Amino acid sequence: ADVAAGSNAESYAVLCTLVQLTKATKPSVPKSKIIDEVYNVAAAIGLAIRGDAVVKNCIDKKDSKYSDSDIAKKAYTERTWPVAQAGAAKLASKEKYASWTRKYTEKQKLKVHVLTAAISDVKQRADKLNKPDKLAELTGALSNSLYGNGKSNADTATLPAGGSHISMCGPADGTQGGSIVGKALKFDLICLCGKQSADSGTGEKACHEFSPLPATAIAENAAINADWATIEQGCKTVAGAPSLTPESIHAALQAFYRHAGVPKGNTRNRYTTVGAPAGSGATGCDGIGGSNGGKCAAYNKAQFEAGTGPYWATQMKAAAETLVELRGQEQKLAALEAEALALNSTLDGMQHD
Amino acid sequence: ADVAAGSNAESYAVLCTLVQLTKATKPSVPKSKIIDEVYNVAAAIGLAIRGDAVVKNCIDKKDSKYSDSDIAKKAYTERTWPVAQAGAAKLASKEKYASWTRKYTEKQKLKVHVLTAAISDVKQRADKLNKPDKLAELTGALSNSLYGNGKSNADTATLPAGGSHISMCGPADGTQGGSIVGKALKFDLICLCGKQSADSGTGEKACHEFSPLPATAIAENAAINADWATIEQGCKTVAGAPSLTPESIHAALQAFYRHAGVPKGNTRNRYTTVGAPAGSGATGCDGIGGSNGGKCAAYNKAQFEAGTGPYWATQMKAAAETLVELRGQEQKLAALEAEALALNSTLDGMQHD
Amino acid sequence: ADVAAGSNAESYAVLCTLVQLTKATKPSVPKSKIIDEVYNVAAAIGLAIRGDAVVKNCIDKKDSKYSDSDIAKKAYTERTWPVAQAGAAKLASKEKYASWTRKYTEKQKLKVHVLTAAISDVKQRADKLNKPDKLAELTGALSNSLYGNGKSNADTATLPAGGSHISMCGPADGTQGGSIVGKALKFDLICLCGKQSADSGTGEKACHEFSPLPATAIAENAAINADWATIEQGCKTVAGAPSLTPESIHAALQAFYRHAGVPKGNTRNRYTTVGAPAGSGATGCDGIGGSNGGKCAAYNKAQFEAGTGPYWATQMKAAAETLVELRGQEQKLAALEAEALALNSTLDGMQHD
Ligand SMILES: *[C@@H]1O[C@H](CO)[C@@H](O[C@@H]2O[C@H](CO)[C@@H](O)[C@H](O)[C@H]2NC(C)=O)[C@H](O)[C@H]1NC(C)=O
Ligand SMILES: *[C@@H]1O[C@H](CO)[C@@H](O[C@@H]2O[C@H](CO)[C@@H](O)[C@H](O)[C@H]2NC(C)=O)[C@H](O)[C@H]1NC(C)=O
Ligand SMILES: *[C@@H]1O[C@H](CO)[C@@H](O[C@@H]2O[C@H](CO)[C@@H](O)[C@H](O)[C@H]2NC(C)=O)[C@H](O)[C@H]1NC(C)=O
Ligand SMILES: [Br-]
Ligand SMILES: [Br-]
Ligand SMILES: [Br-]
Ligand SMILES: [Br-]
Ligand SMILES: [Br-]
Ligand SMILES: [Br-]
Ligand SMILES: [Br-]
Ligand SMILES: [Br-]
Ligand SMILES: [Br-]
Ligand SMILES: [Br-]
Ligand SMILES: [Br-]
Ligand SMILES: [Br-]
Ligand SMILES: [Br-]
Ligand SMILES: [Br-]
Ligand SMILES: [Br-]
Ligand SMILES: [Br-]
Ligand SMILES: [Br-]
Ligand SMILES: [Br-]
């Protein structure tokens, strides 16, 4: 018999909070205008003191790449050529560097270049903070959570060949886990909310009063992307619009853990499972109501207890840690700005001696 | 008929977590004693090297405001006069600046003032971190959450003219939202827990075993502040004392979203609603039990799905972001201290040459 | 009669989230290799300029503790002797300090030592960040949460002398709290899940389908550590593996507050209680089903409302604040690195003059 309409609604809301987290507005990567501006000033000062010949040549060739008549090749390498290019751009714009464009000892020039090289190191370290790019890692963790690692919606359009509804969503063994469950939120929600082959208009509303109803029977090789579209679009109705924050992610995961973790079935023998086992649950998650099966999605008990499953919980935890790191990036940039400005002030004073 | 005692208790606890967050102990604004002390030392050093005449005059006039016989007007402006005032306070206390009070070149004095001006810039930036004041923004977001933006308890003492219990708390249309719901936690809880005009001792306990019972029938122009006092005072009994943290706020919001989001009514057609629709809910949230109305409070489904309602969820999210920013302020001050101390050390060494 | 199997399962999961938080992987203490390396370079530079005699002696005695023929005792004190030791280790390894090992004025040497002393201060402040050690405070808060402050599993092996199941777990007064409840998660879970003296195979499964069943009747002086082992080992099955984060802790506490806070009993008169009061609850938490007692654990209503109980909630909040502080430590170290590197660069340039 069809499972009852609304019988999986609580489970739907719990997983839908996690889905909605993948749709939430993302943060921006912190940036430091101060570090750029200090770097450009130090570049210009460091070039200015090398003499009219290197200055003229560097400006002449500022659009060129480092790759013998050019005197700039003796003062700069491919490594430091971006410095000269930045410095040439300022000195081809300035009267502000007039003090630097006076005369200095070889030693004075040495000490000045210690400071300009140090400022260039700050800029380099500022750039390394987001190598690799943490916004792209965030996006990838969230996409992985929905579809599986490295997968997209289009890659995950069909269920595997050769399994049954039970083997895929929840075996007779109440600790083993469905073969497609705990890999991706999309497949968990297909098991939880999808049409069972004998459903007749009611079981397709186990999770929600969907319109249109899920129409493709969950079975081997089933093409499920239209039903997934309908299922995932309802998540905002039942879980709203939580913010993309580490706070939200860990709150949603602990709710999921307790919701799946309470044992189910009329003998409390269906472990780490969402949805509603019917009767004892002993048949497994067959999608059918009225006997001992049920429309449910079962996780692997041992992975769940160890914190190694579901795989999307690990991706959601990585997303959370990336959000913490992006917050941290802003403070690390502030620290780098403190070093740059201290150096920039010391260098400013040296224009005298 | 009266709705059943306790029939809204779960909804009451969920909203009461958010109420209790507005009563929680607030954080303090981070402060930097180091930056103040470095600023005062640099102020004193910067004044000391300008000569006995400017020093004497600045100390003479340290209590005056910048607004021709005073020689300090040539060495300072209204902008930098606070520097002289800070410096005069130290030099009118010290033998510690004896080294600075020796003789220096015009150039040495120039370079010293580059460093003292840089330290003054650090102090200025330290002060700008809390302009605008983030504790006041926090307080305002929390107050806005309870009463509506810019409103107080006294401003929100009466329900609007011209509406019914249904129009205010939850219309017949199960997606539209009550006209006073989703504006302020106070009015949500008045709809959820308030007396319906025909209640007889039981419906007034829908949310909680209140003593005294809510006594003012929820209807147009109703004066509800005594009932609000009773309702809000019970929140600690059912939601305890969560800490005011961004973690707590986002955890409370995701719980609310799922709690409101599960569809209600015996045909699952009452969307984004808290409390308990009676029967089908089709009558709307009339506060009455036994038929198809119910004592409930309905949010606007489309705003809820978009994350633009309830309006107090947006204020609570702003409160959370302000708490994150106040944490961040402490680290930004540490960075500013690093710049100040580096400069202060460099300046210390210059007392020699 | 035995309480029903599974009748406390929801309460078990809620408390088990907090238990699992104490078993989660801990963070590491942030460290700064940059600050160590800058400190060692400044130590070596600061020693190098003091002359061949102090250099030779310091290296000679680098393994000794500060405690008259040694010339290093005139250049260093017990306070700064670690500096000399660090500096001697470098100068006994280097040709890198060749520039420093040239000739300098007394003034030049003064100014150099201002910078080396400032770098030593950075290192000292870096070390003070984790004095006291925040990882040990974290560990202690989590252990305190489980067992009570300063207690271990072995210290808490037996229930107190002279009380009854009711007096220990939940008195007749539905606001007073059990005498052993709200002190430690371990004793809360013993009250919630332990065997009542007349249980016959079913009541021992109130919380979970334990194997082996809890076997020791909860009564005065009861030796409960074997039953605690079984009870706590099931927590991973029902609450999974939440990460040890401030986000997780505050999310788990707000869930607990609402779960305990909803009033219970058939007249809604059992306040701030977990588990399932039977009938009215008026008998108290006797562990017995079928009448008006029940297998429950009651907190003190007034402490709960004030946020001063349960005592393990305060410890969990301290754990959360320590985790926030350990995150903050990493950013504070970044700031300290900014000061060190700015100073290190300025000192580098002085090798010229
Ligand atoms: C970095 O130091 C430079 C000085 O080299 C600062 O830029 C001077 O600041 C004064 C402000 O009164 C102006 O008169 C000059 O025109 C500025 N430019 C130059 C090239 O000297 C600069 O403000 C410092 N900070 C940053 C972020 O670059
Ligand atoms: C800022 O630098 C000043 C030096 O200008 C430091 O204050 C000297 O420190 C020594 C400590 O041995 C004392 O003998 C002097 O009396 C101090 N005062 C002065 C005016 O020189 C100060 O510690 C540094 N840090 C801060 C926060 O001001
Ligand atoms: C601190 O400053 C020192 C300089 O005193 C830096 O160490 C020199 O850096 C150059 C790199 O081109 C090498 O040729 C030298 O051998 C380095 N060593 C010394 C002793 O001068 C060092 O990199 C700076 N940073 C830290 C963290 O120490
Ligand atoms: Br149905
Ligand atoms: Br986005
Ligand atoms: Br350069
Ligand atoms: Br790279
Ligand atoms: Br089974
Ligand atoms: Br799994
Ligand atoms: Br009733
Ligand atoms: Br306060
Ligand atoms: Br000044
Ligand atoms: Br301002
Ligand atoms: Br309806
Ligand atoms: Br709304
Ligand atoms: Br039973
Ligand atoms: Br560990
Ligand atoms: Br030294
Ligand atoms: Br210490
Ligand atoms: Br009672
Ligand atoms: Br307590």
Residue numbers in the entry:
A (entry chain A), B (entry chain A), C (entry chain A): 24 to 90, 94 to 119, 123 to 130, 132 to 383
Question: What's the publication's text?
Answer:
During infection of mammalian hosts, African trypanosomes thwart immunity using antigenic variation of the dense Variant Surface Glycoprotein (VSG) coat, accessing a large repertoire of several thousand genes and pseudogenes, and switching to antigenically distinct copies. In the salivary glands of the fly, the pathogen adopts the metacyclic form and expresses a limited repertoire of VSG genes specific to that developmental stage. We present here three novel metacyclic form VSG N-terminal domain crystal structures (mVSG397, mVSG531, and mVSG1954) and show that they mirror closely in architecture, oligomerization, and surface diversity the known classes of bloodstream form VSGs. The VSG protein can be roughly divided into three functional units: the signal peptide for delivery to the cell surface (and which is cleaved during translocation), a large N-terminal domain (NTD) that forms the bulk of the molecule, and the smaller C-terminal domain (CTD) that is tethered to the NTD by a flexible linker that can often be removed by endogenous and exogenous proteases.
VSGs 397 and 531 fall within Class A by homology analysis, whereas VSG1954 is a member of Class B. More specifically, by using the classification system outlined in Cross et al., mVSG397 belongs to Class A1 (similar to VSG522, which shares 72% sequence identity with Trypanosoma brucei rhodesiense VSGsur (GenBank: ATI14856), whose unusual structure was recently determined), mVSG531 to Class A2 (the same as VSG1 and VSG2), and VSG1954 to Class B. The conservation extends to the location of the four cysteine disulfides bridges concentrated at the top-lobe of the monomer. As with VSG3, and in contrast to Class A VSGs, mVSG1954 behaves as a monomer in solution and crystallized as a monomer in the asymmetric unit of the crystal. The ability of mVSG1954 to exist as a monomer is further corroborated by SEC-MALS analysis (size exclusion chromatography coupled to multi-angle light scatting). Also, like VSG3, while a monomer in the asymmetric unit, the mVSG1954 NTD exists as a crystallographic trimer that is highly similar to that of VSG3. Altogether, these data argue that, diverging from the dimers of Class A VSGs, members of Class B may adopt a trimeric oligomeric state, at least in solution and crystals, and possibly on the membrane. In contrast to the structure of VSG3, the NTD of mVSG1954 does not show any evidence in the crystals of O-linked glycosylation, despite possessing a close consensus sequence to the motif shown previously to often contain this PTM. Using intact protein mass spectrometry, the absence of such a sugar on the conserved loop at S321 was confirmed (the residue predicted to be glycosylated from the consensus sequence), although a hexose residue was found on the full length protein, even after PNGase treatment. This additional hexose may be located on the highly glycosylated CTD or on a novel site in the NTD that was, nonetheless, not seen to be glycosylated in the crystals.
